[PDB]
Every structure is written in structure tokens, then in C-alpha cells.
Write a protein that binds this ligand. Sequence first.
Ligand SMILES: [Mg+2]
Ligand SMILES: [Mg+2]
Ligand SMILES: [Mg+2]
Ligand SMILES: [Mg+2]
Ligand SMILES: [Mg+2]
Ligand SMILES: [Mg+2]
Ligand SMILES: [Mg+2]
Ligand SMILES: [Mg+2]
Ligand SMILES: [Mg+2]
Ligand SMILES: [Mg+2]
Ligand SMILES: [Mg+2]
Lengths: 200, 95, 52, 104, 207
Amino acid sequence: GAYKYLEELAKKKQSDVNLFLSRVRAWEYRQMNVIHRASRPSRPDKARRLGYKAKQGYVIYRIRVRRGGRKRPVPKGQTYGKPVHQGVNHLKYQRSARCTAEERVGRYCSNLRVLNSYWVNQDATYKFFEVILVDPSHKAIRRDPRINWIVNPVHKHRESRGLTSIGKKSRGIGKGHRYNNSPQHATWLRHNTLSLRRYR
Amino acid sequence: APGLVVGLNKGKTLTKRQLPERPSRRKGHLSKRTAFVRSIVREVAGFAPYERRVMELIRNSQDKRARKLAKKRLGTLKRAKGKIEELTSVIQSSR
Amino acid sequence: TKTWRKWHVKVNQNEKRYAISSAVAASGVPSLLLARGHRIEEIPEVPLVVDD
Amino acid sequence: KKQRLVAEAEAVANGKSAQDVSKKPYNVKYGLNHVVALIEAKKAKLVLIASDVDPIELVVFLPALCKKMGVPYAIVKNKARLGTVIHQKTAAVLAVTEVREEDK
Amino acid sequence: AIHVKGQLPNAHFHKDWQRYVKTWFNQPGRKLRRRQARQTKAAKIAPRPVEAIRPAVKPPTIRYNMKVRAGRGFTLEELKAAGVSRRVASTIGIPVDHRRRNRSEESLQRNVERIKVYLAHLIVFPRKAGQPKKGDATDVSGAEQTDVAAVLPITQEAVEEAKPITEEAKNFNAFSTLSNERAYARYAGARAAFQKKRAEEAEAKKK
RNA sequence: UUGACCUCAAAUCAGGUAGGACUACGCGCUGAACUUAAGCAUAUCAAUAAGCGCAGGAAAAGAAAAUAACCAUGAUUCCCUCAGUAACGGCGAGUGAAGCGGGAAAAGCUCAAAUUUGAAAUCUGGCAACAUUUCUUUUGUUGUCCGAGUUGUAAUUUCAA
RNA sequence: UUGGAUAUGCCAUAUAAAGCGCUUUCGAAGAGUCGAGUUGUUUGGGAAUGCAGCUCUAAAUGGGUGGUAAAUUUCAUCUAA
RNA sequence: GUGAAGAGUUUCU
Ligand SMILES: [Mg+2]
Ligand SMILES: [Mg+2]
Ligand SMILES: [Mg+2]
Ligand SMILES: [Mg+2]
Ligand SMILES: [Mg+2]
Ligand SMILES: [Mg+2]
Ligand SMILES: [Mg+2]
Ligand SMILES: [Mg+2]
Ligand SMILES: [Mg+2]
Ligand SMILES: [Mg+2]
Ligand SMILES: [Mg+2]
């Protein structure tokens, strides 16, 4: 159907069609609020594959996030420590800008659950994302076995605990030798806990 | 297959048998519907600017320059050689 | 004081079994029963075995 | 639809199936995924593409797809006017597959 | 400072290790808890066996491939050859491993035999009591919770106790064969690269 | 002129919902220095203290874009072992995992990508009736109408196919 | 309190949905993502282990992994976003 | 981003 065509065309971000549409939409986005409601997904095919459905209780929000690194917020570049910690400028936040987009939209919609998010645009100053949210109080959500899980209280603010797709990526959650540091603190605890058995 | 632990065909000799098809290994095949969709999309979307630059170097018979540019644009040489072959087919498709 | 002081002591299984064997053998010796404080002056036999 | 179903129900008790009392429907096809499949299968005789589909990528490939498949197509005003035909608020695209003999 | 006999010291106790000391004072308590959970589970699923039947597989690597151990579940081919549908397997306590495959007939036949022995000892109760159906049993009265390991143990591979010494064995040179085979694998690449140079650079001789 | 659609508002609109606290344990962010190196800057202390966000009865992880290199294994977690080892390190002081093996427990699955197209088969809300209850306090069913929804709600499928 | 039993005694669920079975042609599979460079940080991970910024930016038997950088050819194994 | 001259299939003022 149309979804395959939208998926393939979305891969062509340098084509004349997508370059033009990106320019006009980025201009339009910069004219409205940093966080604003989207009436519909700008990328319906991308939204579906990330869990979105066109039913009551699913909500799309758009947000722009400042690009670039994290300047150390210390008074006059003064760090009061050893030279290894004197850096102020070329530093980087450990969470993705997409994660920040989810965090801020989740605070903005504190009655909703953040499901997922996707990139839509960027200029030199901002990256634009659309965040998919679900109303756990809506009956259409609570009676739906495919999205029911998110009502349970263990899924409260899953974006704040790195439990969305981008949150687990930023946490380095993965299988095998490349992710041995694993959940870091839990792995660290296992290796730094002295185990003293009853030798009898 | 000597049945030793050294040499070319080492290891214990058992009765070999044909493993069944794993459909996950079909990935990477080109379905006819997907090929049709991509040809339509290539019609609607054009070529990326670097693709046009590479094709121009191909059309001027600057084969090394095209390889250097495609590798520089895409990262690896392996992706470059695949891209140059694809753009070469496009160029000859128009001829 | 800390809880992770060593409270339990391992003994080799064979030494434990040696100890119990010695203790059972000592129970068959009337002098050792008397020496250990047991008032066994009147019992008919050592070891003392009663019906099932 | 409710009237058709009560007819099929009444005729499914003593007669034959619902096919015996209802005829083949002749109607415009709608739904973007459904119409795309019809075009790829060469069953659309005429495709009417709304002119103001707001995320335009939903239909931007449709003229190229229609031209490739040799199905006639027109870009027409008001997705809202197309929606009125099919009793919806809006419709991105409509397709004619079959027309009665009197309209050929 | 260091002045005594012995190993140079190595103790990794420069962090706040006393904060994360793990003691085992609950070891008998945990053992009692786990046994009570097993007893509670056994009474709940009775008369089903407490443990599901498992396949026999060979451990990987040369250190353990001489042994046999329980695996996760039976392969799709093994279930097929034993006449058990994969959707039915779980309903009667037969685990399914979609990941493991049978690279040899020996692995397949060994586990197909385990399933056949399981099925022959299995009493399937009818879904509706007193109305036996196909694949069920009509003598369910003597049903009790039994160990699968009592019926289908994991058996290690046996040996030839003794056998004649043939003239072929007497002429075999074990050490030379090991040295030759290692050398042949070692210089296969040079031989292959040589063969290219043996037959390709000679092509100019034709013209 | 009206109406439709789109986008955007307002209302003490009808019904909901979030915040604060508890932080032993849990998931993240941010982040020292004392200290050790017989000085000291890399290093170490430490991916620690302090600071900030967010949960539950556990959390997190989880049905391989995993191992291996075998006669192969088979989601995750935890224990023992691997192992103070491979490795890192002014190769100084110091630091330091993983595969196999044994054991505890075991459980497997859901979507998106498909034309239902001889029938949006889907869902919420209002109203009414009828049931139901840890419970006049709970939880539904049917009818009807209105909304949602074709810019796609259901149904068969999820690669093991 | 159908959890088990003749779970009896009975409700009337039960008429159309699954199992294997030969033959075909098939078999849609997640993108500013993977990957590359570079900077910072982190790791036991060593011509980059994970994370993040910025630049470049994919493919269709493709793509990932196979703990020494690179080019090529094989093989194995997995099937990301 | 969009257009015009000039420079020994191109990007520089
Ligand atoms: Mg999870
Ligand atoms: Mg010092
Ligand atoms: Mg000192
Ligand atoms: Mg000092
Ligand atoms: Mg703290
Ligand atoms: Mg609580
Ligand atoms: Mg959980
Ligand atoms: Mg899978
Ligand atoms: Mg450290
Ligand atoms: Mg996938
Ligand atoms: Mg940091």
C-alpha cells in the first residue's frame, strides 16, 4: 500500500522533493512554540511502525531541541579540581537530543505515557522531533490488549528512566561482548561486592 | 575429514545432514514488489547531489576520482564500489 | 565489631566422621561413662541395647 | 448497510445465502492503501487525487505510479469534496474500478 | 613497607569495599525457602512431573564435546520426526527450541528417541473428564507425579572395552600423521597462492 | 450569503488525569576532592560522596543484528567457577572483564510492513434498560444515537515463519 | 468453591473454527538509521568497548558480529534501527 | 537559497 512507498521515499533525504519540504516545514516549525501539538503525524508510516495508531488516546507532540554539546555550567569556566576535570567547552551530554525531546514533552503532558519518538527535521540550531504519547486513562487504551501494558504503574515516566527505544540505546543496553558494561551500576555492583560465605 | 584434531578437515566424523531453511536468512533478497516500489521512488525523488557528482565523474571516465568521492561520501570502499556499480547501471540504462 | 567476622568453622568430612566414630567407641567403655559423670553403676551391660 | 443486513438475515433463514438476496456493489473505491493496491493491480479505471493532502508525501508518488501502470488519473480540488462522496470528512484519493453499463 | 618473604601483595581493597560486603547468614534460610517453593509447586502441578523433559546435547568446544548434557528444548525437526506438533508440544510438557538445529543424524536420532520414550510413558488426561479422545488415555487411575530423570536419564557415551589390533593400526604412525596434518593446514594458503603463480604466470607462454 | 473541510482558540463546558511524601533495595543524569602514587600533573580514590529526574513490590534485563570455531550451544537474571586470569597502566602505584562448565529458576511472545474492498468487519462517549459486586461504594452487557476512524480502526501473518 | 472427583445431578455449550498432507508461485521484514570520520567521555577492550556532539551518510543476499589498522576472497553466525 | 557577467566536463571573484 502507501506505507511502503512512504518508507522508501523517507530514505531520500537529499532529493529535491524532500529538501524543499524540509525547508518549508522547518520554517513553519520555527514559527510556533518550542513544544506544540501536532494534529496528525507528519510521517504517518514512521508513526505506525513505532506503535502509533489512529485511535483516540494516541497523541502526537512536536518539539525542537537545541543542537550541539553541553557547556559545563560552572561560573567562569572555573572547575576547582585537577586538570583532567578543567574542561568546559568540548563536552557532551550522555543522553541523546531525542531523549531530551521525550523528557520535555513528557513533563508537558504529565497525564500521558511517552511511547516513542522520531526525528522529523533539523537546521543548524535545532533538531525537530515528534513524540508519540498514549493516554492511560482513556477507555480505548485500557481495553486494548496490544497497548494495555502501558497503563500499569511500572511504566510511569518510562522516558525519565531510559526505558523508551532511545533511552535504552543511550544506556548501552544490548546483547553480547560489546555491551559488557551492561546496565552500568548493576554490573559494577556485581564486580565490587565482596562475597563472604559461611565457610562451614 | 580425517577424524583428527589437526589438519584441514579436522574433527569427529558424524553423519552429515541438510539443515532446514531458516527464513531469517532470506533477508537481503530483492522482492519484486519492493523493486517496483523503489523504481517508482527513484522516479519521484531524483538523485542525491553526491550521486550526481559521482555519475558525472563516471561519465567523464574519471574512474579513480569517482571511487575516491563515493568512498569519501559513504564511508567505506565496499559501499562505494556497490554505489558506483549501481550508478554505472543507471548511466548505461539511459544510453 | 563487624558482622562479617568468621562465625562458622569448616572441618574435613573425614575428620568429622573420625570424631563421631571415636565418640561412639567411647560410649562402649564403662570407665569413660563413669568418668564423664553418668550414674551407670547398676546398668546390666555396655553398650545398653533395648528391644524394638 | 443496516437495511441490507436485515434483508440478508431474512433471506438466510429459509432461502439461500446473502448472495441470493443482494447484488454486487458498484461504488467508488477509497482509502489510500487500498487505492494504491488497485493501481498496482491495474484495476483502477480512474484515480482522483486530492489537491491539498497536507503531508503531501502520502500522494506525491501517485501520478508517477498511475502513469507507470497506465491508469488514468486527475488531480482535483478538495480532499474535503472527495470525502463527501464517500460519507467521510476527507479522502486523500478515490478510485473508480467498475461502472455500470449505462455509465460506460 | 615490603620486607618479608613471599608474594608481592595484590589486595584490591582501595575502594569503600566495606560498604558492599555480602554475607551469607541467610544461606540456610534461602535453602529452606527454595525447597518449600519446590514442594508448593509440585503439589500445584501434580500429577505432572516437576521438571520438563529436556533434550540431550553435546557441549561446545574441545574441552567438553566429549560429554553429554541436558539442553534447552527439542528442535523443530526433532519434534516433526517424533510426530509432535510444535503447538501441542508445550501443552504436554515438551519444550521447543527454535534456535537449535540438527547438524548430524546422531543428534536428531538421540533426541527423537527421548521424545518417543516420553510419549510412551505419558498419560494425557482427556480435556473433558470421562470422555476420552484421540491422543489421550483411558487408564488415568494410576497417575502419579514421577521424575523424568527416573525414566529418561541423560546417558554419557560408552566405550569399546577391548578389540583386536589390526595390521593397519600396527602400521599407523600417529606422531608423524599429527606433524604432517598440522604442516598441511599451516601451508595451505602458501600452496594455494603458489598454484595461482604456477598456472597463471605460465599463460603468457601460449602467446 | 450559507454550508463543508482544514488549522487555530475559548468556556467554573461533560468526564478524567499529573504534582507532594517515603528512597533500604531499583533505573538514569550530573559529578568532586581528601586519598594512594612515599613529591606530582596522567593514573588512583571513583564511572564513588554531594546535586537532579523517575519507579515497584521488587526494579532493571529478557526471547539473540548471542556464542562459538565444537560431535557444537541456544531469551533474561542470580550463584560457583572461569580469575586477580586475557587485558589496561608515568606497563609506575594500581586496575581488570568474557565465552565454555556446574547450579537456582525456567515461558514465551506482540507489532509495523499485505486489497476485508461482495460491503470499518474496529473503537470512545451520551441516553435507556438489564445484569454484577470485597462493595447501594465494584464490574460489565445489550439497544440506540453521536463522535473517532479510510492521512486506516479490525481480521490472517511476525521470518521459529 | 467446576482448583481437583463419577466433580456427579445436569447446563447446552457444538455446526464451524484448528491439526497434519502433496504441489506450486511466492514470501511486504523498522533510515538522519546503520555505517564512516572526528571531538569529548568511558571501558579490561589494546591503530575507539559503550555513550554523546558535529560532518558525511547507506544497502538488498543486503546488513551486523567474528576483540590488530588496510585492500581483496572465502567461511560461520545473527537479522538492528 | 535564487539569479547575472567574467576564469584559464567543471567552482573562483
Ligand atoms: Mg522492558
Ligand atoms: Mg602523594
Ligand atoms: Mg605521604
Ligand atoms: Mg602534596
Ligand atoms: Mg548520591
Ligand atoms: Mg507503592
Ligand atoms: Mg519490569
Ligand atoms: Mg525473534
Ligand atoms: Mg576503575
Ligand atoms: Mg526487524
Ligand atoms: Mg561524565
